[PDB]
Write a protein that binds this ligand. Structure first.
Ligand code: FRU
Ligand code: FRU
Ligand code: FRU
Ligand code: FRU
Ligand code: NA
Ligand code: NA
Lengths: 380, 380, 380, 380
């Protein structure tokens, strides 16, 4: 996990959302020292357990109510239970990762500090801060608007089925913990995306420095710079591996949640399109599909960019080899090429899959198969 | 994108079809300088938007007509809408790529110029021009004949359902913009295929030169030639990567269109084969299947050939190593082997997939699954 | 197969379970010499044949009984027959592997002896013995408890269908050989897991020694130590390949059994959840799903860990290269890097698949497809 | 294609079966010179066309007969047509490959001659001849017995439906060309398997020679021997690539035929098992499944063995590196390691897939999916 001053707002958002139980103090040097915060550790654990319990309690209440609003049919019951469970598992994995990833966070931030010192020429505090805040604000505003639309639509739908001998609005009110879990999931995804995008951006800055200092006494300093760049590349690879070892289960459950959410939301949209009982419901389902696809991209594109930027450095190094003649600098470039030949760049989600754009294709296939089975199941 | 004098006809076809909004002037040296053409840029954008709007307007008109011709049943409505949407998305991606790929086009053509200068011994202006013109003419004639057959069949079918209180021929007439989109798609595919086939052909020429100059004072010139060949190979790899970064979204949507078109056309053929209402319709569907498969090959085989030709150069270089003894030439061959060891040759469609013949297999599986679900859906 | 003093209990369990027909004598040096035991060879073969015959005889008896308990419906008959056949094939493959893998076992144990001598600094006899005994005891206790629950549930179910003109409890009693096959399968899986986990643990110890002796006269001894570590790594790779060549068919049938068992047990759970005839049956099916998933992990995680630990040594060697300066030691490290560049670490199940965590994903897809077809089949 | 004296019987079988239209003359040196045989070329082409026409004519006759025997139901018609078409396409691809693969055959046999001269120490004329003749005889006897059983079963079935106003035995008699196509397919598969197994066996002999001459004045001769072994390895790789470029389409259609045949035969077996009209039909379907699986293995295992034997030579070369000290011999071993690092060993079926054991897994998945759809289709 990355905890830097430009992106400290994302850190605070994740902290209040039970995902970053760390206490950070900014040094007089501008560095952010990180340690365990037991108060926020127990707060995160308790909030996660309480909200999961409340979410499932509301689910059971809807299922056991006189007029269920969402959990009415066996198919609807199963789909809604799966939708709630994927969110619960994703947020629980994120909280667990944030609880037991302090050492990885410290190592990653130290490595990023040395890399930024090496790449001080391309650091943009203002631009990085604004990109981080914009991503966080856009994600939170999108989820807030979407939750408002969903709750309003479901309140209208529940009032449409309201019978004088029962209240169906409390059923919708009991689904608020699920939306809180959605907010926690959005914060976790924003944090992971910020970290992965920072890693990829640093890879790109390293490649730009390589191309600008080697393709655009003194040779000794140039070789020292190349050694520093190679060390930064190795440290960025290790930072990617740390992010993986820390949040791979979280990323895996996020991907599972995206897949199941897309399938379930498309199934609900198809049902409403056949029945055409409501149009606002249809548009809310389209917005949910867009949100799920956008967050799938949010979790996929960062790792793909990081791997792509790290795997394009070997070509630059080959160019330097072909253009370099100095003995010590040529030897340093040879060492760098050897180091890059065996670089493991792709992000691994607990070893189950390598997170890149190819996943999307696979996802589509699954979303093409299951959803179509599900549709066939409706007919049958 | 490749814009050369031998294939200038393909460039003009793509330009009038809203895909190559560039102004080209032939120098006294025979070189083709390329720049942005704002007139044709706005013409391409406006034509794309207008024809997409007209296509979807005709779709809605057919769906909302008294006697729909094509959009009659929910299954038929969905299938026809998907068929039209894949074409719309493919042509829109191609137009967008041609609009925002001027720098990549310039770089690719400069690189191809230097490569052709290096490979002047195997350049065949007449043969290249005739192959390009033959490909373009065959593609355009095939799509024209197929559109004529389809429109005649659909006119007959609409007249068969004609009731005195309505005209069903205007429904077919309103599907002409869709056929125009098909022409644009054919032009885009022809252009992409010409570029990729040129890259693969240059790879093959480079390999032939390697084998004829190294396996079939003076050693200094031979090493200079080997250095030029290595530079040409690296430039061809970068040209492949430029073509990818420029038209990968277009290739991806072309592949999606081919898959969905094959599935939908096979479904329609199976329906007509059960009902046997018309035989000309069945033969037109078979011709459509052939056309879609042929254009899938048109987009797949070029990249496969390019990768295959680029990946077989390392074996030739190993042979030279095993046969070369001169110091400087041996060092140059070692440098070339090192360069080839880390060559990224496969064509990437926006990172979603690597375009090669393996895709075909996968496609078949999908075409075996979805189509079979679709058939089962008819029964259900 | 690994036969060591710490894990000799697992060896005895596999021996009485017809999986390790070897006679072992402990030398005065603490080494375990292994040879063929013809008495136990014929005992294993005869027990396997007899128990397979009894299992299938009980299956036929249930199918041909007046009131079948498990083999009642065509779907139930097929599912139960597949469930029994996967277990039979898995245990038969394990027994055959143990019968015809004496040379591989001897080679593997010799190699492990030399490796342990090399890694004597990290050997923990007590911890290894306790981990092995704990794994064996947990597996055997889990399968025993699960068999008891299953047999009690099926006895209750059979008594519920009991008619005065027939006894349905003998039908359940005739399924005891199948549970014995389950015990044999558990023992085989425990043995394979112990061997693979030992290989991975030795890889980890080798990497720890590398990092502690090279990143934490004399240089000659250090280079000798590095040569010994490289030899140990190569021997561990060859031990992995021996385990593969010996028990790959067994691992493949174990994976097939896990897949089919998960599908069938989930199908039975879904049936009981629709009918809700019994709740103990549902909980027993959940326990069976947990057991099958846990043993799938038991067979998958060891190979994944071994490959992961073997593939992370090249980065350590690159670090030594970047930090080493001595001539002979630098040459030894270069030799080690060259050796690691071409290391085949992944475990192969008879060439059909590479056993790692990715399999899980694929399995899920299959378990998502077949089971869903099976559910659709119930409706149809 | 391999045409050697030990396997000349397989060559004659393929020649009379329209697959090897070559004239071979044995020199006084024992070498077999190969050339085009126009008589047998036209005989092969004419026989292929005539038998395909007769097969499809019998298919149409059965479909258009008063009482169809095999082509009765739409599902049965489609399945039988696909079964016949896969065989037709496989044999046509094999015949076309044999017609237009004379240059590849000559190159492959020259390379095999030089390799055998290099590996004269491990050549076993008697064993190779007997293995080739045994494979051919077993394949031909199996297909003959299976065709006899199938034709007898279908004659009985046709006589069971015989009505006094028509003859249903001529319908079975008109399916004899299909069995002739099966014989041609068996011969083609036997030839391809013999060639691929010879390549893999030569790879194994090369590895054995490496291990026996380097791990079990004079050093100059040893380095000469190593150079010859490296040349033999490169020639064997090129022979594999020649076999691919010559018969990849044939292998691809053989694999497609195996897949479709397994699916169709299992579907027919399931139908007969539900109806239980005949038991001999069921056993014949089981025998057909066994035959199709065995020929799938016949086409898969050879390439897998070749790749496995070629990919295990680099480890032996690393061992020699680690054990070799002589300057010239060490340099030769380094050259060999460099050559092996970039070896393309896997067999490619026209670029669609790499033929190895992994295919089997994929096949199973397909055979698990389609067949299950097909079963569901019966219910629907
Ligand atoms: O299921 C349709 C949509 O409704 C939600 O459950 C929100 O309450 C989402 O998980 C899903 O996208
Ligand atoms: O759908 C069947 C065929 O008809 C078309 O729509 C042409 O109008 C094609 O897209 C398709 O191949
Ligand atoms: O089929 C449901 C369960 O019952 C068993 O057959 C045990 O008798 C298991 O193989 C399976 O997990
Ligand atoms: O279809 C069942 C079997 O019958 C055959 O057609 C033989 O006539 C085979 O192709 C198939 O294995
Ligand atoms: Na179905
Ligand atoms: Na599928």
């Amino acid at each position: 996990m990355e905890i830097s001053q430009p992106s400290i707002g994302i850190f605070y958002i994740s902290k209040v959302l039970a995902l970053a139980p760390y206490a950070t103090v900014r040094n007089s040097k501008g560095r952010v020292e990180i340690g365990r915060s037991w108060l926020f550790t127990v707060y995160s654990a308790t909030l996660t357990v309480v909200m999961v319990f409340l979410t499932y309690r509301g689910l059971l209440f809807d299922a056991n109510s006189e007029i269920p609003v969402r959990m009415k049919s066996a198919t609807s019951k199963v789909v809604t239970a799966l939708d709630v469970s994927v969110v619960v598992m994703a947020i629980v994995s994120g909280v667990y990762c944030g609880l037991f990833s302090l050492n990885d966070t410290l190592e990653l931030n130290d490595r990023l500090n040395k890399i930024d010192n090496t790449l001080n020429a391309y650091n943009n505090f203002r631009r990085d801060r604004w990109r981080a805040l914009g991503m966080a604000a856009v994600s939170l505003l999108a989820i807030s608007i979407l939750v408002g639309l969903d709750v309003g639509t479901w309140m209208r739908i529940a009032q449409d089925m309201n019978i004088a001998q029962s209240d169906t609005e409390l059923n919708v009110h009991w689904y608020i913990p699920f939306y809180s879990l959605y907010f926690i999931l959005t914060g976790l995804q924003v944090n992971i995306a910020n970290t992965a995008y920072g890693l990829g951006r640093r890879f790109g800055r390293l490649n730009r420095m390589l191309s600008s200092s080697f393709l655009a006494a003194a040779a000794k300093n140039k070789g020292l710079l190349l050694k520093s760049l190679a060390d930064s590349h190795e440290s960025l690879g290790k930072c990617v591996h740390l992010l993986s070892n820390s949040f791979g289960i979280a990323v895996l459950f996020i991907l599972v949640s995206c897949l199941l959410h897309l399938v379930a939301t498309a199934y609900f949209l198809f049902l409403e399109l056949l029945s055409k009982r409501d149009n606002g419901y249809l548009w809310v389902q389209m917005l949910w599909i867009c949100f799920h696809f956008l967050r799938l991209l949010m979790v996929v594109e960062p790792c793909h960019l990081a791997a792509r930027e790290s795997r394009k450095t070997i070509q630059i190094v080959c160019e330097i080899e072909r253009k370099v003649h100095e003995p010590i600098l040529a030897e340093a470039v040879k060492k760098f090429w050897q180091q890059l030949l065996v670089v493991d760049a792709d992000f691994s989600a607990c070893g189950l899959c390598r997170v890149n754009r190819t996943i999307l294709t696979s996802f589509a296939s699954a979303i093409a198969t299951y959803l179509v089975a599900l549709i066939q199941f409706q007919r049958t």
